[PDB]
Amino acid sequence: APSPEEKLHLITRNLQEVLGEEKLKEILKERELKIYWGTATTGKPHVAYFVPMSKIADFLKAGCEVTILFADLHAYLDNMKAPWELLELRVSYYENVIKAMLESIGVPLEKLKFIKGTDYQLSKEYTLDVYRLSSVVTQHDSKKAGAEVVKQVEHPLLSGLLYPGLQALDEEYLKVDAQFGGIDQRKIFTFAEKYLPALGYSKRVHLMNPMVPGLTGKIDLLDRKEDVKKKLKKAFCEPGNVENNGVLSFIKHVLFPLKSEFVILRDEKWGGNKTYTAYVDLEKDFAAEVVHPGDLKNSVEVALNKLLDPIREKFNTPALKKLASAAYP
Amino acid sequence: APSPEEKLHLITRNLQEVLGEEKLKEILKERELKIYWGTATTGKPHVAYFVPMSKIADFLKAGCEVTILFADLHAYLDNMKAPWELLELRVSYYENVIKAMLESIGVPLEKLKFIKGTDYQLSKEYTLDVYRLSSVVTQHDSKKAGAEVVKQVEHPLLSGLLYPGLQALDEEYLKVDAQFGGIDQRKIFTFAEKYLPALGYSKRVHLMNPMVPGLTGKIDLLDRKEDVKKKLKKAFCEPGNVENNGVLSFIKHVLFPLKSEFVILRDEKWGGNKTYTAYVDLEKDFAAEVVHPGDLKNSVEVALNKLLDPIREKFNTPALKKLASAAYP
Ligand SMILES: N[C@H](CO)Cc1ccc(O)cc1
Ligand SMILES: N[C@H](CO)Cc1ccc(O)cc1
Ligand SMILES: [K+]
Ligand SMILES: [K+]
């Protein structure tokens, strides 16, 4: 144990869609799945990142060989969401904060592989494949593949058209069996399944998380407890409304996978604390309005601060404080 | 001698247009001009290539540092006008036949620099510049820049959009002051003048030859004398018509620059042979119809076979015969 079935459950739970179930099961019957998740080194990571980090935790529990890609070249190709000089600083910021999040949720880092895009995306072999891919990929398909990912501007830049192709090639160069990302990556994922074979490379399994609403409808990973409270003070959390609820979503995608349970802090007057072992049970109580928005938020606030504490402490140094400012002037 | 003025004349004679006269004169007042001409390693070079070779001869006579680029990657990016496996064979064929043409017209090869695109177009520094360029070049401008150069197909490939940018970057990596090509390269040349400065590189001088009508309205450099005659037997050469005349054009752009004169072979009955020292004088006589199409063609046929003889002899070996067949199955 875990059995192939148990691994499949851990790997696919909470996902919106799985592409390649046949191959996925063939792999799990014999060996560990090789999978990666990529993130362009753009904006400062916020609490929403705990969502993909939770799936990464699931992959490791399932015995997967996991790689995290810091896509610095992609950040540059996406309408320069980060200058080339600041890219290296942002890669550092991302590496430090992502590792901090993983340590916070108790994910062993000794087995995770961290890689930067420019570590191999400028190599001759990779570049040759970019040109080979460009010879078969139509301008049309490239533009369509990145519609929901690359910033759409009035006068589209050539860089935006290259973006999808490099993400596809990353699957082969990182030597993975699968790629995990949000459902917003779907068009790039299908693009990769169609074109990698054209270059003699295998199509990969694709795991897609749903687009989860945020807690603030953003809470920075380094925000002080005071700001966390203030930002939570809002958040779309209407009584009895279980849809488009960022607070419930955070519990479903982050807290339950982490602790396997969720405790609602509630006054004795209204029933006292209650421990839920399944998200569906909590949702039922929220819909019945026996779990008040204020108590739901307070319960998440306590749990979130527990996740952020070690992170805020880690970055409480002159060096890291300097990096944060340098990476984001 | 040659003086800066004499060099400018040799460099610009017969051209349709010169972009950058100010800088060109500034350079010639102090040093030798660095210039290159590129050719994608696609179809088998034919007699029309003597036109650009004649300007290359002019550049060398003017003391220029000349580079000839065998653009193999470009041949691949232009709707695969040559597979990657055959590219190296075609580069070899091009190198051998272009050098043969230059030797035939008496151009010293010891000072000419021959370079293959893939010798540097796959380097990390060049690749980084391709991505930097892609961040500022719009899809629109890239498509527009190659309209008259890259094969236009129903479903445009991404490779076609990259083509112009690499040709622009070639100017910087080949470290030249200018680029020479046909007027059909104009949109790529203006594209390079606009975008290289965006990357901190200098705009280059651009020399453009007119689009010269061919002798056959194609005569291969290795065609036997019998086939040369047969193909010349046709050719658009109407009596008294000095426009769109491929025979007159070959004399103007190749034979006059080579010999500084042109001899018309004509029977005593019609005036006997006549030696012209200026193309305009020959054109006047052709317009007056005192130089018959048949005699004009015969005069060019004799001169052309003199140019092809050493080339046909050079490739009259088992090795080169094998290469020709291998490069073009
Ligand atoms: N497209 C992703 C951000 O939406 C980031 C990315 C993921 C995987 C890669 O191989 C490259 C970039
Ligand atoms: N575009 C040219 C053929 O029409 C070939 C070429 C010329 C110069 C270069 O740097 C690259 C390709
Ligand atoms: K990001
Ligand atoms: K060519």
From Swiss-Prot, chains A, B:
<dbReference type="GO" id="GO:0005153">
    <property type="term" value="F:interleukin-8 receptor binding"/>
</dbReference>
<keyword id="KW-0622">Neuropathy</keyword>
<protein>
    <recommendedName>
        <fullName>Tyrosine--tRNA ligase, cytoplasmic</fullName>
        <ecNumber>6.1.1.1</ecNumber>
    </recommendedName>
</protein>
<keyword id="KW-0225">Disease variant</keyword>
<keyword id="KW-0539">Nucleus</keyword>
<keyword id="KW-0067">ATP-binding</keyword>
<keyword id="KW-0820">tRNA-binding</keyword>
<feature type="binding site">
    <location>
        <position position="170"/>
    </location>
    <ligand>
        <name>trans-resveratrol</name>
    </ligand>
</feature>
<comment type="function">
    <text>Tyrosine--tRNA ligase that catalyzes the attachment of tyrosine to tRNA(Tyr) in a two-step reaction: tyrosine is first activated by ATP to form Tyr-AMP and then transferred to the acceptor end of tRNA(Tyr). Also acts as a positive regulator of poly-ADP-ribosylation in the nucleus, independently of its tyrosine--tRNA ligase activity. Activity is switched upon resveratrol-binding: resveratrol strongly inhibits the tyrosine--tRNA ligase activity and promotes relocalization to the nucleus, where YARS1 specifically stimulates the poly-ADP-ribosyltransferase activity of PARP1.</text>
</comment>
<dbReference type="GO" id="GO:0006915">
    <property type="term" value="P:apoptotic process"/>
</dbReference>
<keyword id="KW-0007">Acetylation</keyword>
<keyword id="KW-0648">Protein biosynthesis</keyword>
<keyword id="KW-0144">Charcot-Marie-Tooth disease</keyword>
<dbReference type="GO" id="GO:0000049">
    <property type="term" value="F:tRNA binding"/>
</dbReference>
<feature type="modified residue" description="Phosphoserine">
    <location>
        <position position="202"/>
    </location>
</feature>
<dbReference type="GO" id="GO:0005737">
    <property type="term" value="C:cytoplasm"/>
</dbReference>
<keyword id="KW-0030">Aminoacyl-tRNA synthetase</keyword>
<feature type="binding site">
    <location>
        <position position="185"/>
    </location>
    <ligand>
        <name>L-tyrosine</name>
    </ligand>
</feature>
<dbReference type="GO" id="GO:0036094">
    <property type="term" value="F:small molecule binding"/>
</dbReference>
<dbReference type="GO" id="GO:0042594">
    <property type="term" value="P:response to starvation"/>
</dbReference>
<keyword id="KW-0963">Cytoplasm</keyword>
<feature type="binding site">
    <location>
        <position position="167"/>
    </location>
    <ligand>
        <name>L-tyrosine</name>
    </ligand>
</feature>
<dbReference type="GO" id="GO:0005615">
    <property type="term" value="C:extracellular space"/>
</dbReference>
<feature type="binding site">
    <location>
        <position position="36"/>
    </location>
    <ligand>
        <name>L-tyrosine</name>
    </ligand>
</feature>
<dbReference type="GO" id="GO:0005524">
    <property type="term" value="F:ATP binding"/>
</dbReference>
<dbReference type="GO" id="GO:0006437">
    <property type="term" value="P:tyrosyl-tRNA aminoacylation"/>
</dbReference>
<feature type="modified residue" description="N6-acetyllysine">
    <location>
        <position position="194"/>
    </location>
</feature>
<comment type="similarity">
    <text>Belongs to the class-I aminoacyl-tRNA synthetase family.</text>
</comment>
<dbReference type="GO" id="GO:0005829">
    <property type="term" value="C:cytosol"/>
</dbReference>
<keyword id="KW-0436">Ligase</keyword>
<feature type="modified residue" description="N6-acetyllysine">
    <location>
        <position position="203"/>
    </location>
</feature>
<keyword id="KW-0547">Nucleotide-binding</keyword>
<feature type="short sequence motif" description="Nuclear localization signal">
    <location>
        <begin position="229"/>
        <end position="234"/>
    </location>
</feature>
<dbReference type="GO" id="GO:0004831">
    <property type="term" value="F:tyrosine-tRNA ligase activity"/>
</dbReference>
<keyword id="KW-0597">Phosphoprotein</keyword>
<dbReference type="GO" id="GO:0016604">
    <property type="term" value="C:nuclear body"/>
</dbReference>
<keyword id="KW-0694">RNA-binding</keyword>
<feature type="binding site">
    <location>
        <position position="170"/>
    </location>
    <ligand>
        <name>L-tyrosine</name>
    </ligand>
</feature>
<feature type="binding site">
    <location>
        <position position="36"/>
    </location>
    <ligand>
        <name>trans-resveratrol</name>
    </ligand>
</feature>
<feature type="binding site">
    <location>
        <position position="167"/>
    </location>
    <ligand>
        <name>trans-resveratrol</name>
    </ligand>
</feature>
<dbReference type="GO" id="GO:0003723">
    <property type="term" value="F:RNA binding"/>
</dbReference>
<feature type="short sequence motif" description="'HIGH' region">
    <location>
        <begin position="41"/>
        <end position="49"/>
    </location>
</feature>
